[PDB]
Subunit: 284 residues, 4 copies
């Protein structure tokens, strides 16, 4: 569509070809954008962002998004790369040392929790505050962070990441009010389906949680590729009046109370009794 | 507790001893309130409200809550009975001819739908408008309607009643703004668990829907007795600053994304892996 | 962008060049869609939709969206025009006889309220039910209705239309579950800024309400043209996994509790004390 | 006009036989002070707690005397202090108790006049710890010691900045969003196990020590007042609402964020909030009572 022709952007969090940020990167460049990539020194070494950088004809700047100093260096190197200001920024970063080290929500380590909140939420505030201090972002620019419905409605096992996502979504509102009134920069969260990614694979019983979400979601779970398509609309000029929103991209999960497929009495091929026609939507 | 000592109220919708309004009536009188009861002529003949009125030492005034003329007579008869104004009013009325006659949501009769919205929602506006025109309600009075989470999140089978509840909840906001600023009268909805009542029994697959909600709700489903206890707090002086709220009374259902019990892989006695202690909350 | 190349759509409610539906129609055809237009016989005679049909190289099918018979005819004529099924549908319809006749929320006529709810909300269920019975909509198709935040939070004067919008948004969820699981058709509401349209000009003190929302919204109110741009995304393949959503398109109004500009004590030129830099965002 | 009528004593014995732990009573203006007084009038036994510094600078000693109980010093960010607090509370009651009020909030960023676009991130860490994580710390310690009876009730105080942005409210808005999530996360666990309910009360802007620290609090309270059809809720009003949540009557209410704000949370635009409105202007949205004030 050439949706982002002439646009420049900074993308965090592309680890491997499964990463939501990897798909956003590829699609942004396919749609005419120029991008800069960033990840931690460890993720650069252990994943395949080098191949993405090659495909997108750009550079990878190492940064820890919890380090104001690293973020300052990143914005300088990004603005140097572009020869000035850029239009869009994707925060696609999440990690809990509690989840990683198998600490349960009722037995948290509070030093771990501090890192969960810093990596998964405060990093967004740190990126925006540094970018804004350096005036890195053009008027009518677009900032997105990826979030999850555990921020609003509890999911068994999701642990301290649920609370981190509630904090992340609040920062989008808090900083969105400031950046919008000044420079018409919109800031939104995209609340994505459970998705098969490195960070996703660390969620307790993720395969079973994904099946639950699939059964609840009338359109089924959104893929990482689907998410990239949606994020492209938020980077495009067509969403210039959308700000401070938490935007569910989940095939309807957020709006569902009880699907037929989620019921324990349901088996595939049972007749749907809530409709007069198409009573076998998943076949006989 | 004598929570409603000196208070006078009008209770709609007591059909039989299963009715949420029946429990609210019993409990209101136990807590020192004087009440007036109303139902349709047909429901008075077909149900047991006569026995409740005997227990509560009061009158039953026949009224169709879709009839402004019946509501005018009801308010006159209520104020005559009390010798003037009263403090609280319970709307506990719901019916869909589409649900009763097995019309599905994709095959509605639109005359039936008009009646669903009239009985289940517009009757609330009619009751408040007629009461307020006759200045029937004391300053710092309390008006409650009973609603259901389908108003926000879709449940398989719930049909046109979901849309009616969304409409009912909006009327509580719209009229609450007016009655609050004028006479400090609070207007709220209580969003109750799925409950075994005459109206509840008409819901598609209600037993299985109740089972789903019970698995999703950490405290379990609320009974009609539990709901009456909660409604008593809204009629009491202790909630005088709570208005235009939709209050979930549901053992946590509204705030749950996915419980362990709701998962198809779960069986009774399986160890919970989201906690360090009490891993068998439902026994081994 | 060619965002809607090869797509076909039915657009309700284009009255005149200020209508949100008029802007959606222009922008849909600019983006490569083919459309069919509809409005009431009265609106076709009193408005300028004929001019839009000419610019969009298409037909105007008369229909009362409260009439199942008229919707059945409309969907037949639309499918005949396209030679089969279509991809998107815009519901852009609202009217309150209570508001029009100066009846206040505390003194409703209940026959007028029944018409408000029919025109403003039930018409959306009627359109979807008829279309679905005729299998009118392609898999991965997109249905949008225009709504307003009065559905969630009370605005002085907005009257029975607030209640109608809550009902409208519920229909999107109820029907969205069914059409989604069957044919992957998404159904969403766009909750738009107060906008200077014919319907908008009927709102009690619309000018003052629009100024309140402008001051509360950090990006400012969304225009009808801005709204048309957003609706384009929902008809595009890029939003295929977005359904049963009420989507605030309002420059941030829905997420604001209190802006500096909303405060009685604020005057244009006062220093913003909540930031370290850009303390004069409005000069 | 919005001042709720009081005078005659309300004695409902709502909390007769119940035992509670109350955080955050600094002085007679504190919401937690009102909750403590009202809980004892309704028949409860309480234990009080605050920081060493707050105990020394404030008047909690007076409250402790009125409520015939002890003040246990504790920094609610310290797991060790909370472990001590829960042991001293259970020793005082001779076992488990029924309710706990978290009424704690402070931002070093707000106190030091650091703005949201120029946060100190060590200060932010402390805002989040004091204002939100402390609630997790208190529930985790209490639950590990099985301190709370079946059908018990835990409440924390929050503010609508958690959902809708208010000019100047700063990093406390984000802290309140985190606090309300902890209520849901821990409510699921404590509910399913022992039917212990956990809720937040989202209160009006209130003239307290912590409240007076909010940038232009006077002007924010006036905006909320004009936007709230019943007017702002007082600390006394909030205490009355919290009593219902500690009472048996709310046993099926959990993981809720409960707005106690005279309707502020459900309002889009009040007539009073509009710049064109002056006292005594006719309301045109109604046919009757067009001069409601
Ligand atoms: N996979 C899922 O189910 C869902 C994921 N999300 C969110 O999407 C975002 C991206 O994650 P995914 O693509 O799923 O997984 P991923 O594992 O591909 O990406 C996570 C990224 O976070 C980066 N990261 C970790 N710590 C960092 C630090 N200190 N500084 C900078 N970067 C750091 C990692 O290097 C990695 O590139 C996360 O916020 C995640 O929570 C949201 C909803 C669902
Ligand atoms: N049972 C459930 O699962 C739930 C019920 N509710 C609501 O609680 C309210 C009370 O219903 P329940 O006690 O469950 O059932 P119920 O069958 O005991 O009460 C329904 C009442 O509505 C009355 N009614 C019907 N048409 C009427 C008319 N035209 N005018 C006046 N009254 C009329 C009936 O006579 C009956 O007394 C209803 O609004 C229902 O939707 C809310 C949440 C869940
Ligand atoms: N103007 C505003 O401030 C806002 C408007 N909206 C909504 O946008 C939609 C379109 O209205 P606007 O473009 O603002 O005004 P408009 O006056 O340009 O369009 C309203 C349309 O509804 C049509 N209509 C009325 N009765 C009808 C019937 N029985 N059948 C079929 N069509 C009928 C009219 O003919 C007209 O074309 C409405 O739902 C409105 O409530 C939503 C948010 C804000
Ligand atoms: N006043 C207002 O406008 C509103 C206040 N709230 C909340 O109500 C709660 C109570 O505050 P208020 O009664 O308004 O003010 P307050 O100043 O009377 O109470 C705040 C309390 O927090 C305590 N505290 C501070 N740091 C602590 C620590 N490390 N450990 C233990 N305690 C500590 C203070 O000693 C004090 O007792 C707070 O969570 C506040 O944010 C909620 C909504 C509105
Ligand atoms: Cl399903």
């Amino acid at each position: 569509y050439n949706l982002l022709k002439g646009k420049k952007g900074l993308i965090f969090g592309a680890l491997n070809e499964q990463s939501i940020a990897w798909k956003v990167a590829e699609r942004a460049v396919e749609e005419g954008a120029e991008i800069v990539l960033t990840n931690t020194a460890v993720s650069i070494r252990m994943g395949t962002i080098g191949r993405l950088a090659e495909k997108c004809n750009t550079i990878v700047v190492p940064a820890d998004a919890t380090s104001v100093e690293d973020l300052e260096n990143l914005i300088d190197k990004t603005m140097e790369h572009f020869g000035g200001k850029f239009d869009f920024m994707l925060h696609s970063i999440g990690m809990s040392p509690n989840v990683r080290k198998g600490r349960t929500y009722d037995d948290l380590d509070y030093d771990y929790l501090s890192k969960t909140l810093d990596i998964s939420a405060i990093s967004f505030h740190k990126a925006i505050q540094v970018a804004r201090k350096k005036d890195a972002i053009n008027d009518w620019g677009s900032i997105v962070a990826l979030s999850y419905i555990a921020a609003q409605r509890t999911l068994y096992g999701y642990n301290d990441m649920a609370d981190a996502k509630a904090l992340l979504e609040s920062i989008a509102r808090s900083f969105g009010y400031i950046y919008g009134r000044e420079k018409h920069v919109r800031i939104n969260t995209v609340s994505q389906s459970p998705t098969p990614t490195t960070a996703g694979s660390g969620v307790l019983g993720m395969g079973d949680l994904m099946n639950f979400a699939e059964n609840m979601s009338p359109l089924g779970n959104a893929s990482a590729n689907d998410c990239a398509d949606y994020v492209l609309t938020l980077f495009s000029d067509l969403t210039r009046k959308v700000t401070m929103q938490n935007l569910y991209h989940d095939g309807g999960f957020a709006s569902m109370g009880m699907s037929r497929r989620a019921m324990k009495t349901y088996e595939k091929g049972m007749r749907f009794e809530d409709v007069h026609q198409n009573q076998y939507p998943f076949g006989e």
